């Protein structure tokens, strides 16, 4: 969690749930990464319970979020002369999206009651629309490479966290403990109970 600060300055660094200041103390069991690109007016749409463009038709976000998002400007790489047509969105759809659901199709939307079904025209349009990154365009249309670093609560043995030093433990003494992100004060004594190996 230290080699990501030399890429580009961060326009926003909001973090629902886990606070960024303490990413080293916690230790999670699985890390989810969702990478895509957004325009300047589209930055606020990466948030729980939003609508319109992304959090309703393209990338639905769950109501409860304990992860973090990292946003930075990529004008030097993705933005080209007369824009880039590789990045798209979906604007027309019959229904909404479940959280963390990806959709892809080559079909065209049926806006009206006319059974077009493969033929463009009135009340039948392509759901995918391209957007460009021109230098003449303002900040509202700029390449913003973002990632969704989703997390979850401690319900499994932790796997990925920072390289904190693990010192040797002691028994039958008043010593603080830090076991996979949880901390407390007490004594550590051997117990004769039994724990299933899972």
């Amino acid at each position: 969690y230290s080699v990501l600060y030399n890429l580009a300055p961060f326009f926003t660094f909001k973090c629902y749930g886990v606070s960024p200041t303490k990413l080293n103390d916690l230790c999670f069991t699985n890390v989810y990464a969702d990478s895509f690109v957004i325009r300047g007016d589209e930055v606020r749409q990466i948030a729980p319970c939003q609508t319109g463009n992304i959090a309703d038709y393209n990338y639905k976000l769950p109501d409860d979020f304990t992860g973090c998002v990292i946003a930075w400007n990529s004008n030097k790489l993705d933005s080209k002369v007369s824009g880039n047509y590789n990045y798209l969105y979906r604007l027309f759809r019959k229904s909404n999206l479940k959280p963390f659901e990806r959709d892809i199709s080559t079909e065209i939307y049926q806006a009206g009651n006319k059974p077009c079904n493969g033929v463009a025209g009135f009340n039948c349009y392509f759901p995918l629309r391209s957007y460009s990154f021109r230098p003449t365009y303002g900040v509202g249309h700029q390449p913003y490479r973002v990632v969704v670093l989703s997390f979850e609560l401690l319900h499994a043995p932790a796997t990925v966290c920072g390289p904190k030093k693990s010192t040797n433990l002691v028994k039958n003494k008043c010593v603080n403990f830090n076991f996979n992100g949880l901390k407390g004060t007490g004594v550590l004594t051997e117990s004769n109970k039994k724990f299933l190996p899972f």
Partner: antibody
Amino acid sequence: VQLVQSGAEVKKPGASVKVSCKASGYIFSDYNIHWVRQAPGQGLEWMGWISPDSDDTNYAQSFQGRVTMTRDTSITTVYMELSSLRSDDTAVYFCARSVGYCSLNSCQRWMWFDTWGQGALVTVSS
Amino acid sequence: PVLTQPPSASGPPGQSVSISCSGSRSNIGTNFVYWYQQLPGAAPKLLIYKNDQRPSGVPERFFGSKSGTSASLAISGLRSEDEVDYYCAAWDDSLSGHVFGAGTKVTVL
């Protein structure tokens, strides 16, 4: 802009041919160049495009393994080479250019060719 | 998958000339259509792009539309500079490659 191409060449069935198109007057690092062939008796037939900065290329179903793509951004030229050409390849070569970047497959429906290179005529007969 | 076109077209001066270009359901409608014109003994040039959009430097006598399946266009009047063939172009999702028509060489009567 200016898009010059190699002159007319002559060839023999079963041999290899090589043509090149030079890009000038615009930034080469982010503008795609498409390759199309025009034979007498029919219309244009699409062949493929080359990424000027990247290396991923896409080819047609009829020319999946027949064509080869080579690029060199130091001199801003695109090298087009054909191997084991058939006898019905007597046609002209156009180094068609499209605005913007279209490395992905899905951007072709909003893609058009603005400026075209000169016709590189090749004569192939037994 | 194939884009048919008549080999040639004829028309008297000062009269519209009908040009037909038809394709499949995935060739037309699923993807946009494009039109180009080629000078004799030269390189082709862009004429019509983005369906009904007309570029700068190209006059208004070219009226074109893709309709639903068959793309048809007419030219208001005829001149000596309009003796060029026209190529209709569109994208095919199944073929994953561009297709072009045969061409209609308009002859002035």
